[PDB]
């Protein structure tokens, strides 16, 4: 078929600031069975309809996977603004694919706080659609120059999630898969 188990059932997910990008091509994909039988927390399609994705064919498909905050799943959508949309993962206003998310508090959570997932807190400007910033360096606040080390107005642009089982659904980790849309057919 098509390697969707390698995306949705991956043992580990990337952080939102360094989201993965898997190119899907030369496969037959049954979107209908995935939508109908897999119980995700969210399955929203914007430019297409989930129930009729099989009759469509695309030259290439991208699958982006990352882990974000519970109430940050709101801004994985066209036209949304916020921390994630501006600085971590911007989605085009004419996005045509689908956004899939599910709660992963049973895996990405630790009693001592899981710091393995980072998100970009500070940036000079908003992200372009489907672009990422892997390189991390000290951000200048105010007007004073920075020497390359954190200080009074010099911050590490990467802030760590601290997922714990008792944070509640607002702060619990959510694994998000974004599918972007004639070698791929249903």
């Amino acid at each position: 078929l098509c390697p969707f188990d390698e995306v949705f059932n991956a043992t580990r997910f990337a952080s939102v600031y360094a989201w993965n990008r898997k190119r899907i091509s030369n496969c037959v994909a049954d979107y209908s069975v995935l939508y109908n039988l897999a119980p995700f927390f969210t399955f929203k399609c914007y430019g297409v309809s989930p129930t009729k994705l099989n009759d469509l064919c695309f030259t290439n498909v991208y699958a982006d996977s990352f882990v974000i905050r519970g109430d940050e799943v709101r801004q994985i959508a066209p036209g949304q603004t916020g921390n994630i949309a501006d600085y971590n993962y911007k989605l085009p206003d004419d996005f045509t694919g689908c956004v899939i998310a599910w709660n992963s508090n049973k895996l990405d959570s630790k009693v001592s706080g899981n710091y393995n997932y980072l998100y970009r807190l500070f940036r000079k400007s908003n992200l372009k659609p489907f672009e990422r910033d892997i390189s991390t360096e000290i951000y200048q606040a105010g007007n004073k120059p920075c020497n390359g080390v954190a200080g009074f107005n010099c911050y590490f642009p990467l802030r760590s999630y601290s997922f714990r089982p008792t944070y509640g659904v607002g702060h619990q980790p959510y694994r998000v898969v974004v599918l972007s849309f004639a070698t791929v057919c249903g």
């Epitope: 939508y35 039988l37 897999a38 109430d71 799943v73 709101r74 916020g82 607002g170």
Partner: antibody, heavy 128, light 113 residues
Framework: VTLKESGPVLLKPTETLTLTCTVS??????????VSWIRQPPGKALEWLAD???????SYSTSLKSRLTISRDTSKSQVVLSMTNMDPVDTATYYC?????????????????????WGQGTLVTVSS | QSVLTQPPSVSGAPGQRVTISCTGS?????????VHWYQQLPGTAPKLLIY???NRPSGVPDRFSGSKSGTSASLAITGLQAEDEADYYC?????????????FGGGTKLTVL
């Protein structure tokens, strides 16, 4: 889509209530929709009580989580709500609603789901 | 008491605009969650009226509209007919708990003068 609750009942204080909601027009195994319970005291505001979804994922009111219990039976399309240690205050009209997304053509999102279909409600009286 | 708060009652003259407000906490409305509005005519079950921020189901006249701004949401009715005399309930998803919650407004009684 039609949701129907069990008939009105009368209970003594500290009794345990069991309410059954029978659904039609949709299957409880559908991933895009769930069934929830909402109660309204006479001449008061609505209050959400419990929640159940396609994969046995269940949610309850924070203040009433200890007393509430919900379950489903896909073999007969029924959802059951149980409340223990009923007080005379808990008398109200109990509604069975469907937590599904309108604009279902665009997919589903459990964060933005709404009670798009409601039952007619049943009246539960707790008194001596 | 309810997490979401609404004015106890609003009034307006026939054919005149009326607005019902709904404000939330840092969670629910303040956390970017959508707001839905329900209309409950006397002696009847609530009816979905606005299923998302400024989204409207079929069969609802275009004189009903909604909006969201920050930690607050509003429902506006352009005209005012006789049938617009019910209770209007604000609803949202509250994420300040382990399994989540769904919070209703206090209910607003609209009267047509």
């Amino acid at each position: 889509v039609t949701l129907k609750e069990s008939g009105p009942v009368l209970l003594k204080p500290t009794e345990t209530l069991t309410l059954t909601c029978t659904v039609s027009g949709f299957s409880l195994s559908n991933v895009g929709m769930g069934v929830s319970w909402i109660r309204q005291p006479p001449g008061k505001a609505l209050e959400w009580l419990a929640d159940i979804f396609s994969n046995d994922e269940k949610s309850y009111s924070t203040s009433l989580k200890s007393r509430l219990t919900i379950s489903r039976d896909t073999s007969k399309s029924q959802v059951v709500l149980s409340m223990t240690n009923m007080d005379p205050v808990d008398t109200a009209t109990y509604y069975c609603a469907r937590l599904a997304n309108y604009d279902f053509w665009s997919g589903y999102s459990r964060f933005s789901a709404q009670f798009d279909n409601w039952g007619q409600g049943t009246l539960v009286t707790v008194s001596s | 008491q309810s997490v979401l708060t609404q004015p106890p009652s609003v009034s307006g003259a026939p054919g005149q605009r009326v607005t019902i407000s709904c404000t939330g906490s840092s969670s629910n409305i303040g956390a970017g969650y959508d707001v839905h509005w329900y209309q409950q005519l006397p002696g009847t079950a609530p009816k979905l009226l606005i299923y998302d921020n400024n989204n409207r189901p079929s069969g609802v006249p275009d004189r009903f509209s909604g909006s969201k701004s920050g930690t607050s949401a509003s429902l506006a009715i352009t005209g005012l007919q006789a049938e617009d005399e019910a209770d209007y309930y604000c609803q949202s998803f509250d994420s300040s708990s382990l399994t989540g919650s769904r919070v209703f407004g206090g209910g607003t009684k609209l009267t047509v003068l």
